[PDB]
Ligand binder design. Structure first.
Ligand SMILES: Nc1ncnc2c1ncn2[C@@H]1O[C@H](COP(=O)(O)OP(=O)(O)O)[C@@H](O)[C@H]1O
Ligand SMILES: [Mg+2]
Lengths: 69, 99, 51, 386, 50
């Protein structure tokens, strides 16, 4: 037998009730970081064709690093 | 890097493709190349290009312990890489100093 | 650095004004470029820049 | 100022193809200026194989002295390139090998040796490891295909070019291929695709080896008026910033475009007549000059009738600056063809418009194109059995 | 194969110089015999005294 791809996964997605209550407006003073994450995570997710038309290769992953807190 | 492309060809391309030029000259075939300059100047770009154009297998030796299982279960010497380098001759062993 | 070990040492200087234009001419092909871009001026706008 | 230097190499020079076509026309066969400029291209580039075909097809007198001095230099240069390839294959490396056989291909292509150039380019492609260098050979073959209208060459290399641009995301080369594709689409009467491809590259045009930018915008406007709807025309052509800038230096093409959009039908017919003569002398638009003018006349008649329930013959004749008899004959021809949704009441000289549904037009195409497909299926089974 | 030499193969005498060599959706309307539209329009501009 072949199982459905979404089956057999010990890790589950985030449900609507598991969505954190933290807003963007809750975060203060991270415009450079907010922009880069938007341009590299959420904008390619919705504008993948505009990246292809322009010629930018969207980053597959994003590494966020820095001092704790 | 037109000047640099010519320089690296005379040392990595010609000995592989035309060993007779060096035998006629009576000189030893070159074996070691050092590319030096500021980071991002094309050293890794040119080293990969020559290996691509000469059909020489390109091996990057970063000393990573993540790749040691492929090099060999011993991992006591870096010369254990020569076993997999000989099997893929012609080969180019490339190491980049991060510094 | 001892003679006989490294048979050739090749220098990779930072690209000058003309070499920066060639590198600029190479990586800009992968983009949807409007006709008439003055890549020469942008190269002049980047002194001492790497490829 | 460096626009022409940005374009790909001018091999084969597509101007010669236009020059050769112009002499094939009965009107321009005896044109001394067109002969002189063609001979200048032949003499400068030593196109000995092209001179033989030029004199054979056009029944010219072959200058033995000029041919021999052109053949000798072709032999001398080919010997030089053969020596360079021999030197490269013995001492130099693979890249210097490839540059040696590349220059042999360009010289053969330059002198008009089409069969030799295709073989030389094929051999160069086999041992060319650089992807962009491979795609330059394909663009060379596409230019050769356009030069001789070799459809098998164009279609095969256009498909090969599409693959190469996918592996290496070369948007610059992708933009050039659209201009190459659009030129072929013009040559094969695919104005719907030619308009789409030209409009995409109107702001990214660097293919100066094929044509001038003013000529490219001229073609873009021409294919747009016949293949674009009125809402699509105003957003892309009428309000196009790049097209409008060029139209400042091209008052005739701008007048032709805006006459139809602004419903100036008398001027549009005058402009359409001017456009017709341009396309007759143009090697790309010549096979389709009758079709394009007829379709443009259909557009103007349909545009005038679209907004009105009934228009008198005299008003339509007055609008187009033509006689009533002209408009009656033109309509009766077009209504019979099914391309105008109207009928003429000749006793009262009133043209009443109809609104046939899209279902009927789709059904005829399904019957038409399905029958064309079925004929291929029937013919293929005939080949299979025996 | 039993080729049809019985039927008189009328001599070709055709133009082997790529007379058409095209692939379009060709229709009968392009072959209608008529003057160019410029001549038709020029022959009617002066019919109105212009
Ligand atoms: N001279 C150059 N020409 C074209 N691209 C270059 C050049 N130098 C650097 N690059 C680009 O920079 C990137 C990384 O360069 P790299 O070769 O890693 O630098 P380094 O020479 O310090 O190793 C490559 O992907 C390459 O595309
Ligand atoms: Mg580096």
């Amino acid at each position: 037998d072949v199982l459905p791809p979404e089956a057999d996964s010990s890790i589950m997605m985030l449900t609507s009730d598991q969505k954190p209550d933290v807003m963007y407006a809750d975060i203060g003073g991270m415009d450079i970081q907010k922009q880069e994450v938007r341009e590299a995570v959420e904008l390619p997710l919705t504008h993948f064709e505009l990246y292809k038309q322009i010629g930018i290769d969207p980053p597959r992953g994003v590494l966020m690093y820095g001092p704790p807190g | 890097l037109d000047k640099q492309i010519k320089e690296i060809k005379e040392v990595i391309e010609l000995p592989v493709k035309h060993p007779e030029l060096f035998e006629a000259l009576g000189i030893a075939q070159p074996k070691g190349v050092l590319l030096y300059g500021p980071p991002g100047t094309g050293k890794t770009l040119l080293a990969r290009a020559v290996a691509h154009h000469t059909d020489c297998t390109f091996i990057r030796v970063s000393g990573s312990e993540l790749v040691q299982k492929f090099i060999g279960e011993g991992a006591r010497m870096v010369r254990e890489l020569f076993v997999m380098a000989r099997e893929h001759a012609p080969s180019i062993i490339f190491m980049d100093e991060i510094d | 650095l001892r003679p006989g070990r490294i048979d050739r040492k090749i220098e990779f200087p930072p690209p000058n004004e003309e070499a920066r234009l060639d590198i600029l001419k190479i990586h800009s092909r992968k983009m949807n470029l409007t006709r008439g871009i003055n890549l020469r001026k942008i190269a002049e706008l980047m002194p001492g820049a790497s490829g | 100022e460096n626009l022409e230097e940005e374009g790909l190499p001018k091999n084969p020079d597509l101007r010669i193809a236009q020059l050769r076509f112009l002499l094939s026309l009965p009107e321009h066969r005896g044109d001394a200026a067109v002969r002189d400029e063609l001979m200048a291209a032949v003499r400068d580039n030593n196109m000995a194989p092209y001179y033989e075909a030029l004199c054979k097809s056009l029944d010219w007198q072959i200058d033995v002295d000029l041919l021999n001095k052109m053949k000798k230099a072709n032999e001398d240069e080919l010997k030089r390139l053969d020596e360079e390839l021999e030197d490269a294959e013995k001492n130099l490396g693979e890249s210097e090998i490839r540059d040696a056989m590349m220059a042999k291909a360009e010289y053969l292509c330059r002198i008009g040796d089409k069969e030799g150039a295709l073989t030389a380019f094929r051999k160069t492609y086999d041992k060319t490891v650089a992807l962009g260098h491979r795609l330059d050979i394909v663009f060379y073959l596409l230019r050769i295909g356009l030069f001789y209208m070799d459809n098998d060459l164009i279609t095969r290399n256009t498909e090969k070019a599409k693959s190469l641009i996918e592996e290496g995301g070369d948007w610059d080369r992708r933009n050039r291929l659209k201009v190459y594709q659009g030129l072929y689409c013009v040559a094969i009467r695919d104005f719907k695709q030619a308009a789409e491809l030209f409009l995409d590259t109107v702001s990214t045009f660097t293919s100066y080896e094929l044509m001038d930018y003013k000529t490219f915008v001229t073609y873009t406007v021409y294919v747009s008026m016949i293949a674009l709807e009125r809402p699509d025309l105003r957003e892309k052509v009428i309000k196009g910033a790049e097209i409008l800038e060029v139209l400042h230096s091209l008052p005739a093409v701008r007048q032709y475009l805006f006459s139809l959009y602004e419903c100036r039908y008398s001027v549009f017919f005058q402009s359409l007549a001017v456009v017709e003569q341009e396309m007759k002398k143009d090697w790309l638009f010549a096979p389709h000059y009758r079709y394009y003018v007829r379709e443009m006349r259909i557009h103007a008649y349909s545009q005038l009738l679209e907004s009105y329930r009934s228009l008198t013959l005299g008003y339509m004749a007055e609008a187009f600056g033509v006689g009533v008899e002209f408009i009656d004959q033109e309509l009766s021809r077009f209504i019979a063809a099914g391309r105008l949704h109207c009928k003429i009441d000749k006793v009262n000289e009133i043209v009443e418009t109809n609104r046939p549904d899209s279902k009927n037009w789709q059904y005829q195409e399904t019957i038409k194109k399905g029958d064309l497909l079925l004929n291929r299926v029937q013919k293929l089974s005939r080949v299979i059995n025996m | 194969d039993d080729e049809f030499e019985e039927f008189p193969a009328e001599d070709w005498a055709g133009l082997d110089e790529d007379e058409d060599a095209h692939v379009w959706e060709d229709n009968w309307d392009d072959d209608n015999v008529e003057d160019d539209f410029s001549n038709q329009l020029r022959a009617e501009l002066e019919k109105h005294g212009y």
